[PDB]
Design a protein. Sequence first.
Length: 254
Amino acid sequence: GRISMTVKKLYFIPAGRCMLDHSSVNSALTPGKLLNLPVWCYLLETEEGPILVDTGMPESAVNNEGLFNGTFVEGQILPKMTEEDRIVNILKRVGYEPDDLLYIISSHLHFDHAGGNGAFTNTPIIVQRTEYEAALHREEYMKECILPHLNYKIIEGDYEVVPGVQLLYTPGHSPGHQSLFIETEQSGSVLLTIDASYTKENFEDEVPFAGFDPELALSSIKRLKEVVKKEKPIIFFGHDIEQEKSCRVFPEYI
Ligand SMILES: CCCCCC(=O)N[C@@H](CCO)C(=O)O
Ligand SMILES: [Zn+2]
Ligand SMILES: [Zn+2]
């Protein structure tokens, strides 16, 4: 019969930082205090091979806090990225080259999640169709996040990548946002919300936060709460300065 298989290791890998006004983590706050938020990628060691979740910020952000000057989000988003935080350099320091990866999973195509996608020209890049179409046609997305000739593996809805690695369709923060539900050998069930909730309070208290469609984001939180009720996972949020204070990071794993 079937026996649940698990991921060997889940690593949390810091991939630079990004400043956002605090009203992006709580839409009720009056703008004027920036927060220096973590940017994450995740590396999964699986029986099938290594899987990278998200790819950090684009090269244009390197030593360029002013990347969004001149744009509709000038002053609202300030990347904090050095040369060391380029995904290929991160990967090389951990022990991989792009072609070693089995899959890339793009949670969504915001610049802090897909800015490194162009480095992976052979690995299949798993992305929701509604996210891909949004980035193709909407000028809010950076071109770096929707390069045309990458090996996209477009999916629709929930999806099993390999045994132990699940994608949960969680639109709202972006049109085709997806979260991850992972079963690891050391820890059991893990929910990576990604940006379906920037912080614990966005999830527990349903505090509104930056996103394309807040009403959808709330329904995706409600779905994730159903999952949580059934699976009781450990939960990690997308851009949570408080939670970062307790998160085990590379070279530790869960
Ligand atoms: C004002 C807070 C915005 C939060 C996330 C977002 O829309 N990111 C966009 C910004 C560029 O339009 C992206 O990364 O594509
Ligand atoms: Zn986002
Ligand atoms: Zn994000």
